[PDB]
Amino acid sequence: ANPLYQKHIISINDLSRDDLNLVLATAAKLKANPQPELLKHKVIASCFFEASTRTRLSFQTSMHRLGASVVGFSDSANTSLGKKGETLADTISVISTYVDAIVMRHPQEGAARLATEFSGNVPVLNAGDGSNQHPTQTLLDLFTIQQTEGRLDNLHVAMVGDLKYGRTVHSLTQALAKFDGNRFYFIAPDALAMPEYILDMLDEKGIAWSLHSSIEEVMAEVDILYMTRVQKERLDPSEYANVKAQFVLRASDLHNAKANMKVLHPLPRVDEIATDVDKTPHAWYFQQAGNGIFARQALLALVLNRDLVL
Amino acid sequence: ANPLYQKHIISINDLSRDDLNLVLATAAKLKANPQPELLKHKVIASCFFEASTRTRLSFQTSMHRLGASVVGFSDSANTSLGKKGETLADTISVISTYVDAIVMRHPQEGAARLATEFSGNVPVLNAGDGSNQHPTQTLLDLFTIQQTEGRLDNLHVAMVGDLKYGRTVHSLTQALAKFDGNRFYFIAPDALAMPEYILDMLDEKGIAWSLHSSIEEVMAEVDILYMTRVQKERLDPSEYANVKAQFVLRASDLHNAKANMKVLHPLPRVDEIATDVDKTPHAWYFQQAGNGIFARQALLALVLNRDLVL
Amino acid sequence: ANPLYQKHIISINDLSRDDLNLVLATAAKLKANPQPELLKHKVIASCFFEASTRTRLSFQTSMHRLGASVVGFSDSANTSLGKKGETLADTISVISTYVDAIVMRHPQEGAARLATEFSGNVPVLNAGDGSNQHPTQTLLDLFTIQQTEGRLDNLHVAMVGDLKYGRTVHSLTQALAKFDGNRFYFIAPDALAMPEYILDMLDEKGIAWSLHSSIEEVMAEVDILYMTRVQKERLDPSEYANVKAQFVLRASDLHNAKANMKVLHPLPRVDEIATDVDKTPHAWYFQQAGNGIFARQALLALVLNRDLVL
Amino acid sequence: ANPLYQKHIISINDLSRDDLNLVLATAAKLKANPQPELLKHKVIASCFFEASTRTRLSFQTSMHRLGASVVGFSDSANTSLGKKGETLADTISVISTYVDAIVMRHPQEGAARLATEFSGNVPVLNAGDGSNQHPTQTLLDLFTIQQTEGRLDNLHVAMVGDLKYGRTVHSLTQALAKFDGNRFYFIAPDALAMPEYILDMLDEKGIAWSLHSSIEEVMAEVDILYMTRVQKERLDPSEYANVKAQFVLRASDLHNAKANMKVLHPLPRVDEIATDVDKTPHAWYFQQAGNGIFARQALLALVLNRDLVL
Amino acid sequence: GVEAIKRGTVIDHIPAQIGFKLLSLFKLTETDQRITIGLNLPSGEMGRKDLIKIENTFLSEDQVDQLALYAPQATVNRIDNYEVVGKSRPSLPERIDNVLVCPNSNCISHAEPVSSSFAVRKRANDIALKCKYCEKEFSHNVVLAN
Amino acid sequence: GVEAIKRGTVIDHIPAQIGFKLLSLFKLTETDQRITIGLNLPSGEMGRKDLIKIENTFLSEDQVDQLALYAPQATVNRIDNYEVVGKSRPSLPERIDNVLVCPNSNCISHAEPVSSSFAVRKRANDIALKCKYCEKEFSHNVVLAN
Ligand SMILES: [Zn+2]
Ligand SMILES: [Zn+2]
């Protein structure tokens, strides 16, 4: 049985260094030499109780490229679920009576983890459970860094943007805090600063970090520039605009960047990365979305296959 | 040609004793030894004009496990149908120009039966047409009783819950009234009692039934305890709560139940069956939802296959 | 001080026959010779948390016809804040601070009685509270019965329609059974009969009552035909449409009616009284909607004025 | 001519202490002996483009309590036209043509000041404009502080809750720092502290202020506890619920409070003041909601009347 | 039974498993006095009773009646100087307050800072409890549920 | 006074008012076996203490350890035949299940058939308790305002 066989991928916390390496190494082989019939005759529930078209289409394209069938829904608006009594525990107890793996997005923290007490032996992969986890996004990001820098160790990683609510920047700090000698630059306005328990966790394991005011300060030594979305509505309109020049990347800023430097951003990108940055060699946010396919396939192959011998 | 080949499954009334046996015997063989390519190259319209995620996912998982493709929609909210003139007869006349079988759920009584005058030679299976029929639910229920009691004849069946509006309890009484020596206990509050024309039909064919006040009265001789949902809103809030102790099952109640007794319930279950009943050998409502797959596959194999030689 | 001076008008059960009579007397007086500046300088709040355009306009015309100012709202939506946080208690505690009286319709049984406990000294008047009380409707109904029949004692009153859920028929029976010699005929669809407690109060006082099946059984004995709207949606559409040859009133059926019989209805009347009934003299429901003014004016004059000089 | 005669009441910054005092004097006079026909024949427009049922009913009771007519509306929806085409400018240019004064709540900062430029000679009064000003609230707040403390100078005022986004706490600080000897205690969750410019105005005039962490640090020094509602939704639900042992007021905490300390709140108070606080004498927020009448009446009497004789 | 306290209340012959339900529900435990409680005792009739001894407090005529729907055969013995200076048996009240919950899910009581209250009527067989607020009447078996 | 039975557990030295929390929280009343509780017992050695005796009942190890969070300095005493045969004191457990409540309003534990489970970590000046489900860590002071 491979390590991840039939396990529920609920959090990055639950994945070890070795599990992260085993998922990323597999994504590398599937990117290389694909397996279009590997999951043939498997049916996967794509249950998006919270709508997220971008994540859904990547997960379902990944399910399709391995040969599996997909059934599911995207509520948020309404289908007929989570209403008039009918609890999540009962929905999972019906659904895992038909499907082989449950992929789900839910608005409440902890939902995937509860599904797990009800699926019995059908695997539950978490596509997003509120402000808690999202392992699949951290896995495509880790795969983009590994793909472009050649390593996951001894890196210079700047996290720029909303770091207080950024579900993504938190998980990637934890994932990356498992590998060695990584150094962090956090560039966030104070209202949105990287929470203390991530910082505590960093210190404790002897990893280095530093706060900086502007992207200018650290452009030269950066390897991965991970940007995040500031949601305008986490501030007053007035507050938002007023950061004396802002946290928005323009291609001028990158003039002093290391030859290997990559700008990553989970999308939607609205305003923090200017158009002109797209035609720069460093812009890597769409190629990152592309590897979403690979990281997502790896997981489904490993969870549903006792041995993948590629 | 097998009997059900290319027929439209619209009502239980239209199915004979022998047709019920032929669908249940087939579901038994597919449960046993499946056929994942039997409907390959067939495309099925899953047209849920009224949304019902639970029924849709079972029907579509069944369509997928026989190898067929699925196209369709779930309106109730809106897609673009049944609006601004565009009649149901015209929709079916377009859709049966692309698909091989139409599965449909509609809010109005009689809709599946009308579709049938327009599909021409494409089969129309009814997934629910208003307060009228639902043959596919009665077929998974009959298959759950046959599976657990070994027979469909000489049974002791209690129907507990809303029996006046219960579309399910009505159809299963008719289905089961085709086999012999079945005896019925109806336990419903008077506002929700089993309508007279079901009772008339029972008497006429010499089948026995009896009303009882509490589940306590008949626990010992019951074989199948079929529960139904009381929709709170079919009563005043005040009226609802006041039945001196209620029609809710708790595992205490089952202490005197026959070794073979099974509790069936069409779901959603909200309040009439207490959590503690789930970890009892008798609880069988989810395993029933599971056989929805089998009864549903049987039908699609038989309707679309001139000979199933399994 | 008048008996009802600064009294909370919340339930009919709460008003004694003596008080019913004072209300009906005053009203007959204001109709005739109205003092239009009696409530000059009062600010009354019309707080419709549940909206009812007719009631809100009857009550508000009344406030105006007596020289009163009005501030207030209408929901069946969210007004502002009061959706979360604002407890009715906090909302009244602030509104007692502003106005002289609070008229209020709210969708929860007992909302006017809670309000009392926070209105300080400001009187609150119930314009409908869930399925519990509507005193103001029963008062204008008594006034019309008194004004057409010349009395409230020794009458033959037929109550027809949704006797089980009609807020009004429940109250009219409580009010009229506080007078002597009355006989009631209850004509209702089986599933919607007069709840047992109405009938049990009726047998302790030993008031003469009988159930019937169609208006035409008591056509010729009835002094008052009070009709309620059988709500189409709390019933199956094939069941609503199948009751007998209906219990809807057509002028024809009035052919054997007493010269003094009046037909009453709270309104809406959609179908349960036909248009030709409108032309016959027995038609009295619009006349009734107009007596709402004097009844409600009566109410406001006594609650807000120490002694009524007229 | 009174100082404020036909003056636009738009911002608190705009009113001098002399004018604050004239407003508060008049109000103390009208409370006591109200002239109820002072604005007889005026038609005031209550134009709530953003709806606020309490404010709209306080202002409208005021107009009425002084003998004024009212025409107006409420959005948090579309009223008619004004959604497209109708610019606030065109809408005021037409409403100046009708009425004598314009009271208005609008969801955009500066909507009352634009209106001025199109109201011709009609005075406009700001009932709230986005996150900018609410003068009428600060006036009724000063009146309650003055009415309980006997003065507006040399007070110890603790401001608690959402100090960063509370419209009101920003204004109350501007108004009270126009008086001498005041000391402010600011108790707020880290992420929601007093914006730097409030604090910088405070240090130029050199008014004594200090931040704190919980009410219980200044319980015994505080003359006025002004509490704002920490809005649950502009915060993470695990962060809202984790702040200390909360900054919510319970009567217990009042145990060491001065005999004259009053607890104030604009309202809604959902959870930040508990029910037992309501019974203690220090409870003054409903009393406060009532002083809104005299404050707003004051305002309307001066702006619309040349000289006030009372 | 067991031995005595320095003057107060002894509530005995409470049905077994009603004992704690009264300690919690009527909130009898928020006292500074020695409350001694014996659970599931013999040494009193109908097998196992419960028993509560509240020292120094003496429960009013009223509170004594409030036990009636739970405890109706209990004895509220009144002690001074280790001897029963008086003996009360629970008689049925006419208003039970804030211990019950209106079954009416649309009753306003639920969401507000009001204490529940119910008119009590008839005796033993069926005790109808009428909500103060929605004025809907329920059987005590339904009210005494959840 | 209350101090020994033939066999069972004497939970001694509970601080005032926690005795009823423990009864409720650990459902120690739901056993028809002799429990004697004494609340606001003098004990100059405390000022005020509470004592529960569950007769013919033995608290398995971990049960004892859950008491760490509430009456942390209480001595569970085994009496397995007429006297104090084993003394025990509460140690913080590594997980506290069923009894706590997740502070996170948007935690899923709240609407569903799911027992709370929290990871215990005495760190620095208190104990942090991390939810099973929503993975958020809170101070026990937050979690116990409850
Ligand atoms: Zn109630
Ligand atoms: Zn949680």
mmCIF file of N, CA, C and O in Angstrom, chain E residues 38-71:
data_model
loop_
_atom_site.group_PDB
_atom_site.id
_atom_site.type_symbol
_atom_site.label_atom_id
_atom_site.label_comp_id
_atom_site.label_asym_id
_atom_site.label_seq_id
_atom_site.Cartn_x
_atom_site.Cartn_y
_atom_site.Cartn_z
ATOM 1 N N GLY E 38 -28.262 13.026 49.407
ATOM 2 C CA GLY E 38 -28.083 11.595 49.327
ATOM 3 C C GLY E 38 -28.835 11.195 48.078
ATOM 4 O O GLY E 38 -29.968 11.648 47.877
ATOM 5 N N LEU E 39 -28.231 10.386 47.216
ATOM 6 C CA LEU E 39 -28.864 9.948 45.989
ATOM 7 C C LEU E 39 -29.055 8.443 46.005
ATOM 8 O O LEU E 39 -28.176 7.685 46.439
ATOM 9 N N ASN E 40 -30.256 8.057 45.562
ATOM 10 C CA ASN E 40 -30.650 6.674 45.386
ATOM 11 C C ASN E 40 -30.576 5.920 46.695
ATOM 12 O O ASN E 40 -29.963 4.860 46.830
ATOM 13 N N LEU E 41 -31.228 6.496 47.690
ATOM 14 C CA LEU E 41 -31.242 5.938 49.034
ATOM 15 C C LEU E 41 -32.279 4.838 49.196
ATOM 16 O O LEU E 41 -33.339 4.964 48.606
ATOM 17 N N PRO E 42 -32.079 3.773 49.971
ATOM 18 C CA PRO E 42 -33.147 3.048 50.649
ATOM 19 C C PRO E 42 -33.623 3.896 51.838
ATOM 20 O O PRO E 42 -33.879 5.091 51.678
ATOM 21 N N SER E 43 -33.697 3.355 53.070
ATOM 22 C CA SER E 43 -34.079 4.061 54.309
ATOM 23 C C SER E 43 -35.127 5.207 54.216
ATOM 24 O O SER E 43 -35.024 6.307 54.803
ATOM 25 N N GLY E 44 -36.116 4.883 53.379
ATOM 26 C CA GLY E 44 -37.273 5.675 53.004
ATOM 27 C C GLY E 44 -38.036 4.823 51.989
ATOM 28 O O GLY E 44 -37.494 3.866 51.405
ATOM 29 N N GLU E 45 -39.327 5.108 51.797
ATOM 30 C CA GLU E 45 -40.128 4.221 50.967
ATOM 31 C C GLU E 45 -40.225 4.443 49.462
ATOM 32 O O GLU E 45 -40.029 5.539 48.910
ATOM 33 N N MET E 46 -40.645 3.287 48.914
ATOM 34 C CA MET E 46 -40.789 2.956 47.502
ATOM 35 C C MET E 46 -39.403 2.726 46.904
ATOM 36 O O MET E 46 -39.048 3.102 45.788
ATOM 37 N N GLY E 47 -38.626 2.003 47.728
ATOM 38 C CA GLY E 47 -37.309 1.519 47.357
ATOM 39 C C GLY E 47 -36.253 2.585 47.525
ATOM 40 O O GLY E 47 -35.828 2.838 48.657
ATOM 41 N N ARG E 48 -35.857 3.174 46.397
ATOM 42 C CA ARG E 48 -34.858 4.204 46.413
ATOM 43 C C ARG E 48 -35.459 5.551 46.108
ATOM 44 O O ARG E 48 -36.164 5.770 45.120
ATOM 45 N N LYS E 49 -35.233 6.424 47.072
ATOM 46 C CA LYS E 49 -35.649 7.810 47.006
ATOM 47 C C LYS E 49 -34.391 8.626 46.749
ATOM 48 O O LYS E 49 -33.297 8.093 46.509
ATOM 49 N N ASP E 50 -34.554 9.937 46.703
ATOM 50 C CA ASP E 50 -33.457 10.878 46.721
ATOM 51 C C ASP E 50 -33.720 11.720 47.957
ATOM 52 O O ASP E 50 -34.781 11.562 48.591
ATOM 53 N N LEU E 51 -32.801 12.586 48.375
ATOM 54 C CA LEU E 51 -32.996 13.321 49.607
ATOM 55 C C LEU E 51 -32.132 14.558 49.590
ATOM 56 O O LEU E 51 -30.948 14.483 49.248
ATOM 57 N N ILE E 52 -32.645 15.711 49.952
ATOM 58 C CA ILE E 52 -31.816 16.887 49.938
ATOM 59 C C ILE E 52 -31.998 17.575 51.271
ATOM 60 O O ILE E 52 -33.115 17.649 51.777
ATOM 61 N N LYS E 53 -30.930 18.045 51.891
ATOM 62 C CA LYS E 53 -31.018 18.785 53.128
ATOM 63 C C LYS E 53 -30.339 20.141 52.852
ATOM 64 O O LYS E 53 -29.136 20.223 52.548
ATOM 65 N N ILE E 54 -31.104 21.237 52.850
ATOM 66 C CA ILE E 54 -30.553 22.567 52.617
ATOM 67 C C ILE E 54 -30.452 23.109 54.022
ATOM 68 O O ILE E 54 -31.455 23.119 54.744
ATOM 69 N N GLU E 55 -29.281 23.528 54.461
ATOM 70 C CA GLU E 55 -29.198 24.045 55.804
ATOM 71 C C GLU E 55 -29.580 25.525 55.843
ATOM 72 O O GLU E 55 -29.322 26.251 54.882
ATOM 73 N N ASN E 56 -30.220 25.979 56.930
ATOM 74 C CA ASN E 56 -30.643 27.352 57.211
ATOM 75 C C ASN E 56 -31.667 27.947 56.279
ATOM 76 O O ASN E 56 -32.516 28.700 56.751
ATOM 77 N N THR E 57 -31.672 27.707 54.975
ATOM 78 C CA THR E 57 -32.744 28.198 54.144
ATOM 79 C C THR E 57 -33.966 27.364 54.515
ATOM 80 O O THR E 57 -33.896 26.217 54.975
ATOM 81 N N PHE E 58 -35.095 28.026 54.369
ATOM 82 C CA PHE E 58 -36.392 27.425 54.551
ATOM 83 C C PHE E 58 -37.133 27.892 53.299
ATOM 84 O O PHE E 58 -37.161 29.092 52.964
ATOM 85 N N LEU E 59 -37.648 26.897 52.562
ATOM 86 C CA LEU E 59 -38.318 27.125 51.298
ATOM 87 C C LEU E 59 -39.748 27.549 51.548
ATOM 88 O O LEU E 59 -40.510 26.911 52.285
ATOM 89 N N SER E 60 -40.072 28.671 50.917
ATOM 90 C CA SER E 60 -41.386 29.274 51.010
ATOM 91 C C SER E 60 -42.477 28.377 50.488
ATOM 92 O O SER E 60 -42.262 27.623 49.538
ATOM 93 N N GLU E 61 -43.667 28.584 51.049
ATOM 94 C CA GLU E 61 -44.929 27.941 50.679
ATOM 95 C C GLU E 61 -45.040 27.705 49.184
ATOM 96 O O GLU E 61 -45.541 26.710 48.680
ATOM 97 N N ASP E 62 -44.524 28.717 48.503
ATOM 98 C CA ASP E 62 -44.446 28.816 47.063
ATOM 99 C C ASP E 62 -43.507 27.794 46.448
ATOM 100 O O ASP E 62 -43.902 26.973 45.626
ATOM 101 N N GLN E 63 -42.245 27.826 46.863
ATOM 102 C CA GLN E 63 -41.209 26.968 46.316
ATOM 103 C C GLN E 63 -41.538 25.513 46.577
ATOM 104 O O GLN E 63 -41.344 24.643 45.726
ATOM 105 N N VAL E 64 -42.095 25.290 47.762
ATOM 106 C CA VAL E 64 -42.618 24.001 48.169
ATOM 107 C C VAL E 64 -43.624 23.522 47.111
ATOM 108 O O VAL E 64 -43.502 22.394 46.616
ATOM 109 N N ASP E 65 -44.594 24.350 46.698
ATOM 110 C CA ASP E 65 -45.501 23.967 45.622
ATOM 111 C C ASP E 65 -44.839 23.745 44.260
ATOM 112 O O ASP E 65 -45.278 22.916 43.456
ATOM 113 N N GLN E 66 -43.724 24.406 43.971
ATOM 114 C CA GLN E 66 -43.060 24.256 42.686
ATOM 115 C C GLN E 66 -42.465 22.874 42.451
ATOM 116 O O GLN E 66 -42.254 22.447 41.305
ATOM 117 N N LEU E 67 -42.215 22.131 43.535
ATOM 118 C CA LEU E 67 -41.708 20.774 43.362
ATOM 119 C C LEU E 67 -42.825 19.882 42.822
ATOM 120 O O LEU E 67 -42.529 18.912 42.124
ATOM 121 N N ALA E 68 -44.103 20.221 43.029
ATOM 122 C CA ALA E 68 -45.219 19.354 42.709
ATOM 123 C C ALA E 68 -45.224 18.641 41.353
ATOM 124 O O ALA E 68 -45.550 17.460 41.330
ATOM 125 N N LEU E 69 -44.807 19.202 40.211
ATOM 126 C CA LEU E 69 -44.821 18.429 38.958
ATOM 127 C C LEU E 69 -43.776 17.309 38.805
ATOM 128 O O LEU E 69 -43.921 16.410 37.960
ATOM 129 N N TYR E 70 -42.717 17.410 39.632
ATOM 130 C CA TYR E 70 -41.580 16.486 39.660
ATOM 131 C C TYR E 70 -41.625 15.535 40.856
ATOM 132 O O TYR E 70 -41.606 14.303 40.786
ATOM 133 N N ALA E 71 -41.731 16.173 42.011
ATOM 134 C CA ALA E 71 -41.677 15.503 43.280
ATOM 135 C C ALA E 71 -43.000 15.212 43.984
ATOM 136 O O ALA E 71 -42.889 14.950 45.174
#
